[PDB]
């Protein structure tokens, strides 16, 4: 069939957000297993404390993939992370994902768990339907097919711990047989349900130490880990980056075994190895590295390594290297194969084999390791070069083996175009993504294939990725440009300036691009028989070279044609063309009305015919007077020739009349500037004699005219007669009339639709000011070149970048020689450079949602999220805030009803704090919360002692009126002074309150203590405690009074979010009012009523003596 | 070299058996694991080929037939 290549790769692995972190850990030896308490409490049910745990599971860019917020919450974490990983993998290989939409690509996902689905279907009465369309195993690949629009098969294998490699093998077979052009093979595994770990523990597969000491005597069993990995398998004809070539891949099962289903058989593994390598036609001597399964079991390791020895070490002298990524990252059950593939491919990319951890002495039951035939990579070793093999054996019996040929592509030899600046274009969700891609490209400005791949993946629609930026590399005056992209398509227009724009040495900077030089040479061929060559003028060094009219016109038209040729390479078809009279020849080119040869010859003949005719010198000057005003102001024999804009209207005529008009304007003071054209007044009645010879010559030149497109807007003939015969098709008559009839440029500019993206196609952006004023305010001029600029190529690339920032998609790769593929080895990974919009935090099921009242562990340790409690020190000892209990009850009620706290307005009633809980300096205090939904009552207990009691229930009908601030009893009109934060907390300290920084929230408070402002952060406890502090501040009583009862508390989160108003800084604040007459403390969306505080005796610890 | 392609889209027995952390038997996984819907058949009948448990919903059986 056809070759199958690993073209891309992406994945999240333990303690590593991207493959770059995975490699940084592999080489550096950082063990990726940890003793954290993330998934569940360590030691629960006797399980090992160690496990492979991903850094996060709650980040997901829902808006990108079109998942509504309600569906995103119920979606499986594996599915979300796999969608992101798959997109990262597809763009890793330089393939724009849109180039695969609508094709026959397939999705094979190896998944062996549905914990989230079980968690979401626990409560039959409140379960939501879409939980099934996001938690089913089938959707693990069907969602990918739906979003990416792959028409190939969508299968979700299980195959009992070999799912990833089995999916890889199925994709390989599909691509080999021609059923599919490409495949997306992914592996997913997340540890959420402790009961599965307990089952594996009972089977004896796990290890008490959580270390997979593969290939070692102390091997006992593996430690479960997590991992989401995706690879892009494509046929060679469609790939850009080649990590390796799958020479052959196969699967077989152990069959029947006497010992049991779960006992591995080495004979079957040996047979699989031998069959695949023989079928591929390889020789065992070629293999250099074998990525063993390497679980680390007393039984599995001998079987597997003896199989590898009997299969590949039969007759080879030099030893065979062995490795196992499970020593580092643990064992991802279904995703194990793809993790090993990632390790192997990264090792090949960097030219080193990552060291294996936890290997000191070999297993005495493996003769190979004790001998020298089989060697383990205990320290980094350079890659000498050879084939590689990967084997993944599930405990059910399924065996998978793949043979990889590493990509050995030498770096491209230096070429002349290497020095030339190359343009880079990036698109992204957030400015950070664009800046990351730009910086990565900047660090590698000399990597042509890398820059081409980046430029390929950046052509994503602006709606999906509203941030774009360009960074011209290799230029001395270079830097990133980043700006937001407006939505909606914007028209692309062209402008071709007149005969004024000309300078000595134009086009040399652009002569280096192949397309431009080819176009200039074609123009020279068009003009060669006449007697001049455009390139001769360009390479020339005389200032007077271009002061000849014929030379000027020929060179200008040739350069404009070259610019249009460069534009057409990138795929830009103008939606409107409008040019000044020398320019229209080029405008004729833009629409296909004029052939290149015709246009160049026409320019030469215009220049000549102007040359032959001898007329009295006539100076054309543009004066700052309105077109209509110049109509009468223009002296007899002088007419307004060009209508540049409303402010400025060019006028031409005899040199003496024009000088007289200039003098008169100087007397008036109006802007009277005289241009230089060698005493020639264009678009004036003087040229009326030139036409006849020009008429004949052009009739000879343009043989069969062509229709004028609706895009072109002729400024030679007013808009009234745009349907006449004269302007129906370009010909000698049209060009002659343009050379004679006055220019109506201002008339056409009005027709440019609002939000257009204009391009000034000319050697100099002379009409930049004219376009900036005349055209509507919201249009972008985008000039291609500049006069006397040292390197016009950089300016042109910057102009293309500004096109990129306007929405129009142009590819700068077409402007340079193509990059042969596959790309050279060592081309940097692109997957790590992609970043998403992870502002939101979606739900991930907890370990207490599966079968086994609510209990909360208050750990004040540094890492614990409850660390802020260490600032609630009263009497010199840390106490749990009274409002802390309310948050616990709120969360428990929210979990009971099924809502979140932000979505659950609550009403506490008759709260009694029976005793105070002291938070120990070391350790934890466990608080239980019990509810009686029928009675609407709650009890918080601590070691069997009652702590808090009261009533809690959802607020059926919140009323925002309840939080309107009562009119203060004291007008306080003067308000001369107010207490700052420092002063309020100094007073509280003197009373005996030692609140730390976290529990300091009163930005200001009135002298009477009846009003103020409460700072808002993500924490409710701090906010409500600051309300209680405001209540206490105005009290005259001395000594620290602590709450003992509350009669009513209302929380309405919606009104709260509406009440917050940001200060001039970035801080969010809420106004507070305390009414001691009414016994209400109302601040933001909270309402405390009937607070009672009782004096607490001072601890008399009297630590000071 | 015979192979087994079994179309299964449910693991209810896995959930019921693994509800009690302090009484769950180890071999509940062998008989209730989804992949065991084909590996067990291969083990008993001594089939040395593929053993895969597809998961496409409403079409797992016919997808297995196609494979």
Swiss-Prot record, chain A:
Residues 975-1102 are annotated as: C-terminal hotdog fold. The modification N6-acetyllysine is found at residues 70, 298, 436, 528, 673, 986. One of its GO terms (molecular function) is fatty acid synthase activity. Residues 838-1102 form the PKS/mFAS DH domain. Residues 838-960 are annotated as: N-terminal hotdog fold. Ubiquitous. Prominent expression in brain, lung, liver and mammary gland. Residues 2-406 form the Ketosynthase family 3 (KS3) domain. Its main location: cytoplasm. The active site is at residues 161, 293, 331, 581, 872, 1025. GO terms for cellular component: cytoplasm; cytosol; extracellular exosome; glycogen granule; Golgi apparatus; melanosome; membrane; plasma membrane. An acyl-CoA binds at residues 647-648, 671, 773. One of its GO terms (biological process) is establishment of endothelial intestinal barrier. It is found in: Cytoplasm; Melanosome. Keywords: Acetylation, Cytoplasm, Fatty acid biosynthesis, Fatty acid metabolism, Hydrolase, Isopeptide bond, Lipid biosynthesis, Lipid metabolism, Lyase, Multifunctional enzyme, NAD, NADP, Oxidoreductase, Phosphopantetheine, Phosphoprotein, Pyridoxal phosphate, S-nitrosylation, Transferase, Ubl conjugation. The modification Phosphoserine is found at residues 63, 207, 725. Coiled coil: none annotated. It comes from the Eukaryota. The relatively low beta-ketoacyl synthase activity may be attributable to the low 4'-phosphopantetheine content of the protein. Fatty acid synthetase is a multifunctional enzyme that catalyzes the de novo biosynthesis of long-chain saturated fatty acids starting from acetyl-CoA and malonyl-CoA in the presence of NADPH. This multifunctional protein contains 7 catalytic activities and a site for the binding of the prosthetic group 4'-phosphopantetheine of the acyl carrier protein ([ACP]) domain. (Microbial infection) Fatty acid synthetase activity is required for SARS coronavirus-2/SARS-CoV-2 replication. Homodimer which is arranged in a head to tail fashion. Interacts with CEACAM1; this interaction is insulin and phosphorylation-dependent; reduces fatty-acid synthase activity. This is Fatty acid synthase. The lineage of its organism: Eukaryota, Metazoa, Chordata, Craniata, Vertebrata. The gene is FASN. The chain holds residues 2 to 1111 of 2511 of the full protein.
UniProtKB/Swiss-Prot annotation, chain B:
In adipocytes, S-nitrosylation of Fatty acid synthase occurs under physiological conditions and gradually increases during adipogenesis. It comes from the Eukaryota. The active site is at residue 58. Ubiquitous. Prominent expression in brain, lung, liver and mammary gland. It is found in: Cytoplasm; Melanosome. Fatty acid synthetase is a multifunctional enzyme that catalyzes the de novo biosynthesis of long-chain saturated fatty acids starting from acetyl-CoA and malonyl-CoA in the presence of NADPH. This multifunctional protein contains 7 catalytic activities and a site for the binding of the prosthetic group 4'-phosphopantetheine of the acyl carrier protein ([ACP]) domain. Homodimer which is arranged in a head to tail fashion. Interacts with CEACAM1; this interaction is insulin and phosphorylation-dependent; reduces fatty-acid synthase activity. The relatively low beta-ketoacyl synthase activity may be attributable to the low 4'-phosphopantetheine content of the protein. This is Fatty acid synthase. The lineage of its organism: Eukaryota, Metazoa, Chordata, Craniata, Vertebrata. The chain holds residues 104 to 170 of 2511 of the full protein.
